[PDB]
Design a protein around this ligand. Sequence first.
Ligand SMILES: O=C(O)[C@H]1O[C@@H](O[C@H]2[C@H](O)[C@H](O)[C@H](O[C@H]3[C@H](O)[C@H](O)[C@H](O[C@H]4[C@H](O)[C@H](O)[C@H](O)O[C@@H]4C(=O)O)O[C@@H]3C(=O)O)O[C@@H]2C(=O)O)[C@@H](O)[C@@H](O)[C@@H]1O
Ligand SMILES: [Ca+2]
Ligand SMILES: [Ca+2]
Ligand SMILES: [Ca+2]
Ligand SMILES: [Ca+2]
Ligand SMILES: [Ca+2]
Ligand SMILES: [Ca+2]
Ligand SMILES: [Ca+2]
Length: 480
Amino acid sequence: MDFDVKDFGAKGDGKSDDTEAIQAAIDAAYEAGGGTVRLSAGEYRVSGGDEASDGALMIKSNVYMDGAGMGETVIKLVDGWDQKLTGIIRSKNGEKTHDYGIRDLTLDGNQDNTEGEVDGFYTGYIPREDGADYNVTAERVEIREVSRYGFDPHEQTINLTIRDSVAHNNGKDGFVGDFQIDSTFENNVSHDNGRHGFNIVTSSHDILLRDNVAYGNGANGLVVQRGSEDIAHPYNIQIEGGAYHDNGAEGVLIKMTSNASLQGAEIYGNDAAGVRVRGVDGMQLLDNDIHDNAQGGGKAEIVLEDYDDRDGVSGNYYETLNATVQGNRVAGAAQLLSSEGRDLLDGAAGNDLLDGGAGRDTLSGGGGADTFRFADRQDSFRNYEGDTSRVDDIVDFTPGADLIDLSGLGYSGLGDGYNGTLALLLNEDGTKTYLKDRQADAQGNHFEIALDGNLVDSLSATDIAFDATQLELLGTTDLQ
Ligand SMILES: O=C(O)[C@H]1O[C@@H](O[C@H]2[C@H](O)[C@H](O)[C@H](O[C@H]3[C@H](O)[C@H](O)[C@H](O[C@H]4[C@H](O)[C@H](O)[C@H](O)O[C@@H]4C(=O)O)O[C@@H]3C(=O)O)O[C@@H]2C(=O)O)[C@@H](O)[C@@H](O)[C@@H]1O
Ligand SMILES: [Ca+2]
Ligand SMILES: [Ca+2]
Ligand SMILES: [Ca+2]
Ligand SMILES: [Ca+2]
Ligand SMILES: [Ca+2]
Ligand SMILES: [Ca+2]
Ligand SMILES: [Ca+2]
């Protein structure tokens, strides 16, 4: 059954406190078993409760609020409110609220004329307890001028959808997804917020972030992170399309997350790296357009690195693992470092640094002068049985342009492959060129690298750095 707020005494005049009248329509719609609460165009002033957890308006199960449009219907916090208010619209703490939503309206937190932390839209059940809100929809909603978090769906919410919405000029993050599950953020814009455009945090998993745009935020365009507590990391985070540009830090930052994907985005004009990946297990970075980042200083368009939390709350060291970096256009340097397991690392037009770490990795530099680093003799090797897997291959080594950094391995130079030298060998059919250590170590292992193609004639000693002195002289990058 459909309910109009004006029928409950709501004025929408910008001056009268309409909180009770709008909540009356909510409660009547909830008592009918569900329905739509409609708000014609106008500015409805609203106030909070006794506690921050009271929010301002309590949406209920099977209740949807439909305004007359963003800008047309504005729900604005009263002048002078001085109490922390957790959700101008919110579901009840300790209730699994379900099948509710808001559409075509503006939430205005009025931070210029209020004091206290205010969040726009708050969802969820109980922090650190099992249970969830579910089937939650925000469609064409604008949240602005809240002092902290604009869209703040919270622990836990399953099947939250926020689409075609905007968060701007909020004091902290425009969108936070806090322990969101099986949820969708699609075709949203988050801009000119105090800190992050989008912030996916607190164990959120199976999240689609499709065709979102974040610009002009004080910190990240999008950050996906564990957060500050020792809890399960987020995982299964798929970032598809959109644009993360002109933000105060990295365009996209992903850290302490498993199975994350960033594909087909445009990423530019950010003050820090365009993309930064710290301690991510399973990272796919495909077909993105990355340019003109590090505007605030910095040497890298793309940064892959570990996340050392040993001095932090978990006590753990988190490696970036299982990385696939292909198809990107990158107008600047990519630092692509990974660890145990098979990595596929493709640089682009910049002067890139590539290191797949342990395991059988396939590396390519693309354009420019690229350094392929092998930090450990066990990072590319063939074993006693002749198991040729675990041997890295470099797809496109360019003699006179690229560099093989062996400076930490203690080989003296090219030679016959014994006594600390490496042999340069062509395989039987002349399809691959090998650098080989013919001397087995105590475990029977042989350091070996495959260079795809025939380079036995074009490769020279000046294409390999065999010690730190040679690396300082020959290094192609500004990232070592
Ligand atoms: O980033 C961070 O610093 C951490 O943020 C964490 O999320 C916070 C939320 O932002 C809210 O402030 C949320 O407030 C909860 C309270 O935790 C509490 O459960 C409260 O419960 C009330 C209940 O509503 C009712 O009034 C009853 O009568 O008394 C209860 C009581 O006061 O104990 O309701 C508040 C609410 O729902 O607004 O709390 C969480 C939190 O985790 O504490 C979180 O993301 C954390 O991981 C971050 O580190
Ligand atoms: Ca709830
Ligand atoms: Ca203020
Ligand atoms: Ca390159
Ligand atoms: Ca590897
Ligand atoms: Ca190259
Ligand atoms: Ca190693
Ligand atoms: Ca390797």
